[PDB]
Design a protein around this ligand. Structure first.
Ligand SMILES: *[C@@H]1O[C@H](CO)[C@@H](O[C@@H]2O[C@H](CO)[C@@H](O)[C@H](O)[C@H]2NC(C)=O)[C@H](O)[C@H]1NC(C)=O
Ligand SMILES: *[C@@H]1O[C@H](CO)[C@@H](O[C@@H]2O[C@H](CO)[C@@H](O)[C@H](O)[C@H]2NC(C)=O)[C@H](O)[C@H]1NC(C)=O
Ligand SMILES: *[C@@H]1O[C@H](CO)[C@@H](O[C@@H]2O[C@H](CO)[C@@H](O)[C@H](O)[C@H]2NC(C)=O)[C@H](O)[C@H]1NC(C)=O
Ligand code: NAG
Ligand code: NAG
Ligand code: NAG
Ligand code: NAG
Lengths: 173, 323, 323, 173, 323, 173
């Protein structure tokens, strides 16, 4: 998509992850597992929910067709009346169909962007303490236990804590 | 072999598809349909106020009181009105209804008619108010006529000039109907109303008209070759209506008190009551929906989704699903 | 320990908020309001051209010349026209103004009327042009009548047939008004115009009508139970209008030259002049704005912002502000 | 936002930079200070200004309601006329409201994008001659005087000139 | 020292520019124009079926049969109709065409009129069907008249009551025309039709009218100071039309079978036939285009692009081109 | 643009590259040359073509004006009718003109995105086996024949295959 993440450098989604839209899969000695990023999923939920409501809201001042009768010598204005009703019905149909097509494209891109942002959040924390495999994963230049993983997930990664053992493993390769 | 963490996104067995400008049929994890496409195929009460279904009577047939329309002699307050495309019982005696569409319109802005006797039929002492009856308007096989309007005919070979007046003392507007008869030839004119050349004049604070019968020979419609032309007015609460005529006068007996003014409609539909209740009604059926859109029919009444001509409106809420 | 460079973005003490699809009330560094929401609550002159304020007069009252409307005997060029919702001074003698709405429309496409005497009141030698007066149309407490139009009455128990003709020699279209009187009874008919059956025929290149007074008894409106029906036509620059009548004729004396046609309007408003000037006027007040949008009132005249039903239209121009 | 910069990896704006929307804060031996990137700022100003002017321009052919009068037996066309007027008033109100909502969202993301591009402009110049702190700041691996700071800011950084002294400083680390 | 790979994008000598919200005149590698701005400037067939071009005749002149409109005595099936703005051959004898516009509308929903003789001119045994002729309707230097309708005038100083009837035996609707004459004065009245006071009565299952001549003195138009007023109705496949009149009747001779009802139009254009063909026609010329939009003229007929008021509509398809 | 690639860090397009929208320029010992990336190019062709077709489809239920005539005492309804016809023409003109502007912009950013993503596709494969010049080019830390180049283009670069040849060239310099 627009942001290269969803169906991009991260090829495919995870059936295993079910409690959120975006998140992590870790893999250490203590074991592996899927886990949802609460912050980014919720933020997205708020955005799309606000979007659906904003779309529903902007359409309440829409046109409402009313029955009007005309006789055999009122054909011109009957026709004018039909053209007007059809006219507005066609305008609001365009307005809804198009608005739906457009926000659908952006909804998709919003998710793509949300994934690329989550990936970068982790990337910018880890720096040289890990290697970018290029498929959405970071292979650590050190051992990252479950609590360290938890540190990455909640944005409190202590780069200098692992800086030295990371450097040592960098230079041996 | 090193420890790793992966960033990724949700996926499921969902098949819901969605459209965008660049791509069509995009399988997605979560979607919201925003288009309602179903109705119960029934005409229902609107928020606890029953609708007026005219069946085979038209508004004309109802209001004038076509003898086949007795069902509607005393209608209660209504939400809306349902009339068929071509009701069978319209003007039983052939003719015209003046400014009919404007009257149907005024109706659509009305919730309650209370019928009132404005000049009793018995009160025509010096004219014949009894042979004013026709085979074109059969009642139960017996010849009759419009029930709210009286076909005054000459008595004892005399049609004295009519000078009648009614002062609206009620607090509500009043709808008054009357008419004129257009005979076939000068012969029939004298046969029915003595005077050969006639007029009908109506006077109100705002109204002033003088109608003269237009004789012609016409094809027979419902057996009759004559024509009746009906007129109406609204009589303001302290105004009075003055009739003066020397023949061809079809006089009012019953008029209509506008008890409740509100927002209403005249729905064209061929179906009938369903004994249900709703907040949203359509000529094809009722809607119970929370969708913001529907595509059943443009002409609706009540709290409704917005009509739209689409076959499909679905918003992506989730993300692009993987195969 | 080391030299560094940082990339960053502006922030300030702004509290201005802005809305988007996904988020509401987004504090932003810079925003532009594009909706004008204020007016001066006054009716004003439009680009140095004063409007015609009818006060308590109606357009009919003005043009026919209701004696209570003397302020407008000779009004200057106007920009737009202001008329109250339900003006008191309309038709002082009760009746109708045919195709009145179509006449107001013609006005709204007009800026300047020059009144001209088309048939001098003095030229009525064999009819009474002095008794055509009513207490329904009081001047200074004394019974009077519309000023631009003459209620001709029989003289010496005779109402000779009238044949007046006027050829528009001007270079402009000319608006001519006339009328017919509808009496209460055959008696009143006789008292005013001797002759019992009357007509009024008017002839033009395009116009052809023959009016016959419709006698009836109507409720009293301003004391009067008769009615007057007024008519108008536009007489093209080399055309002529032909009147022929033997009674009930309400004759033109003054007609109106359409001097300036332009884009104008009849604004329905209850307010009066303010001695100010504006470039954009609405029935609630004038607008002094550079905004591209306003929400004051839909019906405006002059160079105006585009009306919209919003309470708020503010564009984000700066970026998301940090707390 | 969509591009992860504003309120993203750069967590916060600077009250201190006042001569523009986007820019730099440098810090060397000669001293520190804020400066706006004139180029990217002017581009954004031009873009937003054209946007505002385009929105106001697209609305000149909008509907204008006209006073029209009708009598008691013209209730149908009176109502038709009213529905027509309200009809267009509702359409154009939707169009103005929606256009503003949509372009507001794009504008916020536009700024986000200008910032992320500015950061990338510097990053792609510095390469291994500086360290990504991950907060919008690059820590230099060499001496960057005021004139050097100015070369980064105007896109004339001479990477190889500092390449050697940078490389040497990286390797004792 | 090293091998390298570069990622890059297309560029060319294109000058095509395109607009967006934030930037105008953005040069691009590839664009698609979607606005058609050209036409052949001539009137053409619509899918091989010739339009009816009235040249200098009006619709009235055609249907009534103004002698100068003989070109159209028998027109074949048409796609659309073209009428000039101010056709010279309209009503040769001055007057009006009642509900003219409603008739033109019915025309535009019609493709084929087949003229049929409904009342033979020869069949008027007791009236003069030959002197009903005017200098206002000149043919070959001699006074004439509308060809589809007959000006019956008194014979041997007597004008017997007319009672003629026509029953539609065809399977099509048929359009019937008739008229009434408004003389200048009572002398002329007696001169042409013996009786001093007259009427024209028409009857149909749905129609009932009785027209009475309104005499007035009018300026001369095309030499005549009298007026003729024309009327019409549609006679349903099994209905009959009944005329009864004692004077001033302009009787039908020819009526029109409505053979093909379809979708058509009446185009106002000043240009004439071009012997070409198209799928889309405009008042300024025809359109042969695959473009989805055009800015030629709003009033079009056939499968057309959608009209839009733009001078320019161009989609970017390629990418931003580099200088 | 929004994505920093077209007219961004890759300053300028290639006149020399003529068989596609996005692609590669290689330069090794075997010789240099332009080649178009068919898949990502085709993908855009699919996208823009659908976009043009979808805009045209959404405009098929547009308003179509009809001739109606009125007489001298029908001026109110004449004017109502003209106001309505102009009303829809103005609405539909706005609708088309704005949609074209909006989609034109998005189409340009789409291309910007397609290029930026293609750049990342290569970058994420090559990693430390090549150096980012910062102008859209990657300088290799090893020997890359025509066979190697074809592997990068089709996403089949074997990182560890050259990791060692590449590692050697990194540290001696
Ligand atoms: C209809 O009847 C009412 C009720 O009597 C009339 O109004 C009254 O008129 C008399 C004399 O003018 C007054 O003494 C009463 O006080 C009036 N009643 C009210 C309502 O105040 C009314 O004029 C009649 N309407 C017509 C048209 O004749
Ligand atoms: C966009 O290009 C055209 C020139 O081709 C300019 O368009 C306007 O109209 C004509 C077209 O030739 C010019 O002669 C005018 O000078 C132009 N007026 C405007 C809008 O400035 C236009 O100038 C170019 N766009 C801009 C912003 O410079
Ligand atoms: C109204 O008056 C004008 C002015 O006299 C008439 O126009 C004249 O028509 C005659 C033909 O009879 C010409 O010879 C003159 O040149 C015209 N005069 C001018 C100055 O235009 C006009 O015909 C009259 N209209 C009617 C029908 O009464
Ligand atoms: C979209 O999918 C549906 C079937 O699920 C079908 O109606 C339609 O053909 C598809 N669209 C395209 C572009 O084929
Ligand atoms: C017209 O003639 C037909 C055929 O003879 C007949 O069926 C029909 O009744 C006639 N119409 C009328 C009402 O005169
Ligand atoms: C926006 O802020 C205003 C207070 O100034 C208030 O009207 C509204 O609640 C806010 N919008 C929402 C619902 O967040
Ligand atoms: C459309 O135009 C071409 C020439 O430009 C020509 O073939 C003809 O006029 C039209 N095409 C068809 C369908 O014949």
């Amino acid at each position: 998509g627009l942001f290269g993440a969803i169906a991009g450098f991260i090829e495919g989604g995870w059936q295993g992850m079910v409690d959120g839209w975006y998140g992590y899969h870790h893999s250490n000695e203590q074991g592996s597992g899927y886990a949802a990023d609460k912050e980014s999923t919720q933020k997205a939920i708020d955005g799309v929910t606000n979007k659906v409501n904003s779309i529903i809201d902007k359409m309440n001042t829409q046109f409402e067709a009313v029955g009007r009768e005309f006789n055999n010598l009122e054909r011109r204005i009957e026709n004018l009346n039909k053209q007007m009703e059809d006219g507005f019905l066609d305008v609001w149909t365009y307005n809804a169909e198009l608005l739906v097509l457009m926000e659908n494209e952006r909804t998709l891109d919003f998710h793509d962007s949300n994934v690329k942002n989550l990936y970068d959040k982790v990337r910018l924390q880890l720096r040289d303490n890990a290697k970018e495999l290029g498929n959405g994963c970071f292979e650590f230049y050190h051992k990252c236990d479950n609590e360290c993983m938890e540190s990455v997930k909640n944005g409190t990664y202590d780069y200098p804590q692992y800086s030295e053992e990371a450097r040592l493993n960098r230079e041996e390769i | 072999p090193g420890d790793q963490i992966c960033i990724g996104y949700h996926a499921n067995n969902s098949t819901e598809q969605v459209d965008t400008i660049m791509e069509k049929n995009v399988t997605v994890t979560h979607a919201q349909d925003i288009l309602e496409k179903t109705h119960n195929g029934k005409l229902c009460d609107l928020n606890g106020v029953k609708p007026l279904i005219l069946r085979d009577c038209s508004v004309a047939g109802w209001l004038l009181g076509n003898p086949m329309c007795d069902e509607f002699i005393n209608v209660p307050e209504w939400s809306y009105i349902v009339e068929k495309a071509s009701p069978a019982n319209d003007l039983c005696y052939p003719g015209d209804f003046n400014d009919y569409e404007e009257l149907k319109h005024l109706l659509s802005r009305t919730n309650h008619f209370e019928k009132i006797q404005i000049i009793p039929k018995s009160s025509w002492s010096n004219h014949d108010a009894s042979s004013g009856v026709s085979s074109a308007c059969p009642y139960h096989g017996r010849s009759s006529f419009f029930r709210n309007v009286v076909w005054l005919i000459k008595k004892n070979s005399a049609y004295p000039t009519i000078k009648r007046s009614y002062n609206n003392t009620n607090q509500e507007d009043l709808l008054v109907l009357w008419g004129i008869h257009h005979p076939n030839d000068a012969a029939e004119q004298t046969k029915l109303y003595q005077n050969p050349t006639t007029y009908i004049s109506v006077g109100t604070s705002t109204l002033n008209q003088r109608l003269v019968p237009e004789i012609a020979t016409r094809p027979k419609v419902n057996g009759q070759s004559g024509r009746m032309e009906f007129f109406w007015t609204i009589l303001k609460p302290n105004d009075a209506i003055n009739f003066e005529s020397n023949g061809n006068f079809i006089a009012p007996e019953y008029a209509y008190k506008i008890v409740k003014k509100g927002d209403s409609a005249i729905m064209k539909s061929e179906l009938e009551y369903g004994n249900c209740n709703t907040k949203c009604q359509t000529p094809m059926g009722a809607i119970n929906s929370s969708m913001p859109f529907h595509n059943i029919h443009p002409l609706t009444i009540g709290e409704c989704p917005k009509y739209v001509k689409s076959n499909r409106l679905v918003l992506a809420t989730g993300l692009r699903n993987t195969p």
